[PDB]
């Protein structure tokens, strides 16, 4: 219940009796680059890859990190726990029976550095009745001899883009077995034309 992905963009698709929209994933398919067996690692499971950048380009140690169960010329590699690898290669070309339910994740489009304004919700102050820190603002940070200070970990200034995350459960809508692609109808949990993965948790009894 795993799949690695170089994702494209999202685009409307029609579903049955109504159109609706999904998003584009592409995965050449990984290949148990490394396994972590339990004697090795008890965080036991799989480390795979799903593509390949110019050949010369491979660091030596890499050349061999491959040597091992040998593979090809990528760089798109990463692992995951309790994830078995009943294969030497896996491409979703079934791996993910469409009209199946998935959970997914990846890089979070590098935002910027936004005042209470953007970062957190409930932005700024007002504007007219008293505008020198105008419309937008930064609330109050605590107080005198109550905690004799400014608090410790409540929302705050700048940097909130160069970050990542995952979107819970959504649609595996359809699987295009050739051009290893999946249309899902999700938030593209981060840019498009870039990276994410798919995994499917849910002892989920509605």
């Amino acid at each position: 219940m795993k799949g690695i992905l170089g994702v494209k963009v999202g685009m409307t698709r029609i579903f049955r009796d109504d159109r609706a929209v999904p998003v584009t994933v592409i995965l050449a398919g990984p290949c148990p680059v490394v396994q972590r067996r339990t004697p090795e690692k008890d965080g036991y499971t799989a480390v795979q890859l799903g593509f390949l950048p110019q050949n010369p380009k491979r660091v030596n140690r890499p050349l061999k990190g491959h040597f091992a169960k040998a593979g090809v010329e990528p760089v798109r590699i990463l692992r995951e726990i309790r994830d078995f690898n009943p294969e030497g290669d896996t491409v979703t070309v079934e791996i993910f029976k469409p009209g199946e339910r998935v959970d997914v994740t990846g890089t979070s489009k590098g935002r910027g550095f936004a005042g209470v304004m953007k970062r957190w919700n409930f932005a700024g102050g007002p504007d007219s009745h008293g505008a020198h820190k105008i419309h937008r603002h930064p609330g109050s940070i605590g107080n005198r001899k109550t905690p004799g200070r400014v608090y410790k970990g409540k929302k705050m200034a700048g940097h909130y883009g160069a970050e990542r995350v995952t979107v819970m459960n959504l649609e595996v809508v359809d699987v295009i077995p050739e051009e290893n692609l999946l249309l899902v109808k999700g938030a593209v949990p981060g840019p498009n034309g870039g990276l994410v993965i798919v995994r499917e948790t849910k002892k989920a009894a509605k």
Binding site: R111, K118, G161
Partner: protein, 117 residues
């Protein structure tokens, strides 16, 4: 709100434009000029298409790049004097090359960029 950006420039837009034009022109004149890093990069993209049209050659082309340069002498001189020598290549009729030094007091890294021969 912002991060992705296409093309990108300083001063102000009417200003910039003013620049692009003036420079584009002066350079046309000497085939090579010196300014600061950026100035170069850009005047490059710019004079790049202008001149592509320069070759394009004829009624319309003249009409446009002229729309910018405003002037027979230069205008035409390009159009017929150099455009030719350029008619064959696939663009990038410009070459941006970073110089030795920097302007005084400011310490600005300059370049020389010319029409490529």
């Amino acid at each position: 709100r912002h991060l992705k950006s296409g093309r990108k420039l300083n001063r102000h837009s009417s200003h910039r434009l003013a620049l692009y034009r003036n420079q584009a022109k002066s350079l046309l004149t000497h085939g090579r000029i010196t300014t600061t890093v950026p100035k170069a990069k850009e005047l490059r993209g710019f004079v790049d298409h202008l001149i592509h049209l320069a070759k394009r050659g004829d009624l319309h082309a003249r009409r446009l790049v002229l729309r910018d340069l405003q002037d027979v002498k230069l205008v035409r001189k390009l159009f017929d004097e150099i455009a030719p020598r350029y008619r064959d290549r696939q663009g990038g009729y410009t070459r941006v090359l970073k110089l030795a030094e920097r302007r005084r007091g400011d310490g600005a890294p300059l370049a020389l960029v010319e029409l490529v021969e």
